[PDB]
């Protein structure tokens, strides 16, 4: 058995058993592997043939596979082609800092805005485009908000359509950079707002006749935090009684007796965090001499510039409502529901956000849990979808310059001095 | 060469805080029992239930100082060693050559006719703002970053530099800002001082034949 | 999905041990007319139940489940590519100097 891609199946009508020129008939095992796809392409009372005297029936018969004979035959190519998404050459962006490169990426019409709009349109999102045009992906507005960018059709004037005015939005965020190993450089490190922690000075004395290396001075500094939570429950019972005793020579004695019992349960959870900084010095001292040492620790703010060359990747989020006529979600809703989904345009992170994984899994019905790519191929054609997805997943390269900054980090100093003869 | 003597000294502090809440219920009843051969017995019964919640936070700090000596001793001989630790005040002078940077704070009220704040207030409000004249620390206090971002309207969150260019001219603003951000160099001499730091001493003595 | 190398031997193993109804309704032999389905992290093989059957409790068909796959590598064949990072958050940093004022390397 070999995998069967539903877009390559063909139905010949050349008599019982006869099957194409470079085509072989599908076996019962392969037909069952994709049963729902095949049944979805048949008439309600249709009967078609398979290999070794089997037969498959249409939706009216609940898609039963049983022995029989028929004139039709479902067939598959003898040497099938690979329907893989092609890889294009990289797109180069002029140098700058991170925000400069992001600005140039999202304002490109032919390389970013059109392919992403067409991707959203093919999956079934509504109203991808502005009011001043009739084509997909034209008259779009780009805006900067926080750490990302938003692309949406312009809504100025009037429009004709049931819910025109609820326009689909595309969001770009979460940029990452894959560096070339031999291109990173940084400049001078500068400090400000310095506060002393601790210091130590000392001497290392050697009075023997050989060089000695066995000395050590160490200074360490730690900080920590912690937290905890507890719950308790309890029960109790008490019984009291009054008792009298007319003992001889006492006449009468009164007293009360009480007995109690209790029970309790408790439960606790917690955690902590610790950070530590350590410094050491270990001098080598010549014979009949001595050496001084010193160690210091500070807290300070740190800054420096840098530059490198990298590959750029990001997240893509699509928001809107899905069309009533047809959409590509695997449940195919018809209540025009609002929808959000995120793709990762770059290296693999998980199945739900990887276009390549889902595209290479359209032959296993049990894996189809987010988007139905067979439906898009059926609606638009194989090469159209291949070319659109190849343009969406195109690699990006740029040169970057930037600045690093952080508050209240550590700064140290360790010194070995000049020897003094004894 | 296999010898070692080590002396270590530590100090620490800690703190904590806690909050607690609780609830309780009690029910009491009086009951009598006229059992045979007892006539009557009186007693009271009580049952209670409670529940509690607690929450805690804390932290600590530690400082440590360690010293070691590891002598190499010739064959058929012996060597004496000694280690000491003190607390003392430390002083020394120094000198160097450096670049100088500082903070700049402007305080006043903004003019009613026109001002460069991005919201352009007209109620003559009091205002404070700090710039860092030196290396970059963050966007709000960096003149160069904001100046190179006047082409992105979504980045303009503190001062409107396009308005200043429109009011005064491009070259005027360029020259004024170039004079404001001019580098400064100097030679420095100074004194260091601190109280109750650490001071040590480690010694290896002369060998004695056996 | 291999019939001659996986499905038949496993069905015959289940039949020899005494399990009932190992096979589908459209055949009379052991291990024929079986359905393969993907569910979670495993696969299920069971006889097809479509139509009618003759027998006391035909309809309660035996299922075979495959899961928990493991891989024993050849030592000299493993390779990996480039390691990439994303969503970076700083924890801590330190800078310092090491000064040598004596007459030998230290």
Q: Identify the bridge partners of residue B95 per DSSP, sorted by sequence position.
A: B189
Taking an 8 Å cut-off on Cβ atoms, the answer to whether A200 and B197 are in contact is yes
Dist. CA A225–CA A223, nearest whole Å: 7
* Distances A277 to A190, A218, A261, A297, C93 between C-alpha atoms, Å: 20, 11, 53, 9, 10
Quick check: B52 and B8 in contact, CB under 8 A? Answer: no
**Exposure of B173 in the CB half-sphere (CA atoms within 13 A):** 14
How open is the CA angle B143-B149-B152, to the nearest 5 degrees?
150
As given in the structure block, the two tokens for residue B180 are: 């404001």
**Neighbour count for residue C91 (Cβ, 10 Å):** 5
Query: Among A141, A163, A159, A139, which Cα is nearest to A150's?
Result: A141
Report yes or no: B43 and B177 within 8 Å, Cβ to Cβ: no
CA–CA distance, B80 with B71 (Å, rounded to integer): 9
Place of tokens 């800092």: A97
Burial of A258-267, coded b for 16+ CB within 10 Å and e otherwise, reads eeeeeeeeee
Q: What is the DSSP letter of A60?
A: G
Token pair, residue A208, equals 């023997």
Q: What is the CA radius of gyration of chain C?
A: 30
For residue B131, CA distances in Å to A211, A376, B169, B172 come to 55, 55, 22, 20
Q: How far apart are CA A75 and CA A65, in angstroms?
A: 16
Check B59 against A209: CB less than 8 A apart: no
Nearest to A325 by CA among A335, A311, A316: A335
Residues of B in contact with A226 (CB under 8 A): 56-59
CA–chain centroid gap for B37, Å, is: 80
Interchain contact, B44 vs A239, CB within 8 Å: yes
Q: Which two tokens stand for residue B28?
A: 């009491």
State both tokens at B97: 């050559």
The beta-carbon neighbor of A411 closest among C1, C35, C95 is C95
| A345 and A315 Cβ atoms separated by less than 8 Å | yes
Of A34, A21, A354, residue with least CA distance to C35: A34
Candidates A27, A31, A33: best to mutate against C (most CBs of C within 10 A) is: A33
Would an 8 Å CB–CB cutoff place C67 in contact with chain A?
Answer: no
Contact status, residue A133 vs residue A139, Cβ threshold 8 Å: yes
Task: Write the DSSP string, A307-330.
Answer: EEEEEEEEEEEEEEEB-SS---BT
Which DSSP string corresponds to B64-123? EEEEEE-----TTEE--EEEEEEEEEEEEEEEEEEE--EEEEEEEE--SS---BTT---S
Touching C: which chains, 3+ CB pairs < 8 A? Answer: A
Query: What residues of chain A lie within 8 A of the CB of C2, using their CB?
Result: 1
Q: From the centroid of its chain, how far is CA A187?
A: 33
- Test A212 with B71 for CB contact under 8 angstroms: yes
* Cα separation, A376 vs A271, whole angstroms: 50
Q: How many CB atoms lie within 10 A of CB A372?
A: 19
CB-CB neighbors (< 8 A) of C37 in chain A: 366
Long-range Cβ pairs for the range B172-180 (8 Å, 24+): B177/B143, B177/B147, B180/B133, B180/B143
Technique behind this structure?
A: cryo-EM
Rounded to 5 degrees, what are φ and ψ at B179? -70, -30
Task: Count the helix, strand and coil residues of chain C and give each as a percent rounded to the nearest 5.
Answer: 15, 20, 65
H/E stretch holding B77 reads strand B77-78
Count of beta carbons in the 10 Å neighbourhood of residue B165: 16
Q: How far apart are CA B140 and CA B131, in angstroms?
A: 8
* Separation of alpha carbons A332 and A363, rounded Å: 19
* Tokens matching residue A229: 């939570």
Q: What is the DSSP letter of B153?
A: G
> Can you read off the two tokens belonging to residue A275?
């950070």
Torsion of CA A400, A406, A409, A415, to 10 degrees: 50
Tokens found for residue C47 = 């006889």
The 10 Å Cβ neighbour count of residue A311 is: 18
**Residues A151, A116 contacting (CB under 8 angstroms):** yes
H or E element that contains B25: strand B5-33
Residue A355: φ, ψ to 5°: -70, -40
Q: What are phi and psi of A404, to 5 degrees?
A: -105, 145
Alpha helix ranges (H) inside B31-169: 143-147, 161-168
How many CB atoms are located within 10 Å of the residue C55 CB? 9
Contacts of B22 (CB under 8 A, 6+ apart): B50, B51, B52, B53
Question: How would you classify residue B109: left for phi > 0, otherwise alpha for psi between -120 and 50, otherwise beta?
Answer: beta
Distance CA(B88)–CA(A136), nearest Å, equals 78
Q: What totals of helices (H) and strands (E) does chain C contain, helices first? A: 1, 5
CA A337, CA A323: separation in Å to the nearest integer? 8
Size of interface A-C (CB pairs under 8 A): 89
What's the CA dihedral at A244, A247, A250, A252 to 10 degrees?
A: 20
- For the sheet containing C34-39, what is the strand order? C34-39, C42-47, C63-66
- Compute the distance between CA of residue A365 and CA of residue A361 in angstroms, rounded to an integer: 8
Instruction: List phi, psi (to 5°) of B10.
Output: -130, 150
Q: Is B59 helix (H, G, I), strand (E, B) or coil?
A: strand
Nearest Cα to Cα of residue A3 among A58, A73, A74, A80: A80
Look at residues A276, A277, A279, A220 and name the one whose alpha carbon lies nearest to residue A416. A279
Bridge partner residues of B155 (DSSP):
none
Chain A touched by B56 (CB under 8 Å): yes
Inter-chain touch B57–A225, beta carbons under 8 Å? yes
Name the residue among B120, B128, B124 with its Cα closest to residue B110: B124
Cα torsion C30, C32, C38, C42: sign: positive
| 3-state DSSP assignment of residue A58 | coil
What angle, 0 to 180 degrees and rounded to 10, lies between the N-to-C axes of helices B161-168 and B170-180?
Answer: 120
- Backbone dihedral region of A157: left (phi > 0), alpha (psi from -120 to 50 degrees) or beta? left
CB neighbour list of residue B61: distance below 8 Å, 6 or more residues apart = A222, A223, A224, B12, B13, B14
Chain A residues with CB inside 8 Å of B65's CB?
200, 217-220
Check residue A104 and report its DSSP letter.
H
- A44: helix, strand or coil: coil
Q: Residues 6 or more apart from A62 whose CB is under 8 A from it?
A: C50
DSSP state of A82: P
- Diameter of chain B by CA atoms? 117
| CA angle in degrees (0–180, nearest 5) for B100-B104-B106 | 165
3-state percent breakdown (helix, strand, coil) of chain B, nearest 5: 15, 55, 30
8 A C-beta contact, residue B65 and residue B85? yes
Whether residue B120 contacts residue B113, with contact meaning beta carbons closer than 8 Å, is answered with no
Q: Would you say A322 and A127 are in contact if contact means Cβ atoms under 8 Å apart?
A: no
A9 token code pair: 């199946």
Residues B194, A192: C-beta atoms closer than 8 Å: no
Q: Which of A189, A188, A190, A180 is nearest to A400 (CA)?
A: A180
């Amino acid at each position: 058995a070999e995998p069967v891609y539903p877009d390559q199946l063909r139905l010949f009508s050349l008599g019982q058993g006869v099957c194409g020129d470079k085509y072989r008939p599908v076996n019962r095992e392969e037909a069952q592997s994709v049963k729902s796809n095949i049944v979805g392409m048949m008439g309600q009372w249709q009967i078609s043939g398979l290999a070794n005297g089997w037969v498959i029936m249409g939706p009216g018969y609940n898609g039963e596979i049983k022995p029989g004979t028929a004139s039709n035959t479902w067939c598959y190519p003898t040497n099938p082609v690979t329907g893989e998404i092609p890889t294009l050459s990289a797109l180069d962006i002029p140098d700058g800092d991170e925000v400069d490169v992001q600005w140039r990426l999202v304002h490109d019409s032919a390389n970013f805005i059109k392919p992403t709009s067409y991707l959203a349109h093919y999956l079934g999102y509504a109203w991808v485009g502005g009011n001043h045009s009739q084509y997909v992906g034209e008259d779009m507005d780009v805006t900067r908000d926080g750490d990302g960018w938003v692309i949406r059709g312009n809504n100025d004037g009037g429009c004709d359509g049931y819910r025109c005015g609820d326009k689909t939005a595309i969001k770009v965020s979460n940029f990452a950079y894959n560096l070339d190993p031999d291109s990173f450089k940084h400049g001078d490190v500068t400090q400000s707002d310095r506060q002393l922690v601790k210091t130590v000075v000392g001497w290392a004395v050697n009075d023997s006749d050989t060089p000695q290396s066995g000395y050590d001075v160490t200074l360490r500094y730690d900080t920590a935090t912690n937290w905890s939570k507890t719950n308790t429950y309890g029960l109790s019972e008490k019984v009291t009684t009054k008792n009298k005793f007319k003992w001889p020579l006492v006449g009468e004695t009164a007293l009360s007796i009480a007995i109690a019992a209790n029970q309790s349960w408790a439960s606790q959870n917690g955690g902590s965090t610790t950070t530590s900084l350590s410094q050491s010095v270990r001098p080598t001292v010549p014979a009949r001499s001595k050496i001084p040492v010193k160690i210091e620790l500070y807290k300070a703010d740190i800054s420096y510039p840098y530059e490198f060359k990298a590959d750029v990747s990001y997240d893509l989020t699509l928001s809107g409502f899905l069309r009533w006529g047809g959409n590509a979600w695997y449940t195919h809703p018809d209540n025009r529901p609002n929808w959000n989904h995120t793709f990762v345009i770059g290296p693999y992170k998980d199945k739900a956000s990887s276009i390549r994984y889902q595209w290479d899994k359209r032959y296993i019905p049990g894996e189809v849990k987010w988007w139905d790519w067979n439906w898009t191929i059926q609606q638009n054609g194989l090469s159209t979808m291949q070319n659109n997805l190849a343009r969406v997943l195109r690699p990006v390269r740029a040169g970057i310059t930037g600045d690093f900054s952080a508050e209240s980090q550590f700064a140290g100093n360790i010194e070995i001095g000049a020897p003094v003869p004894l």
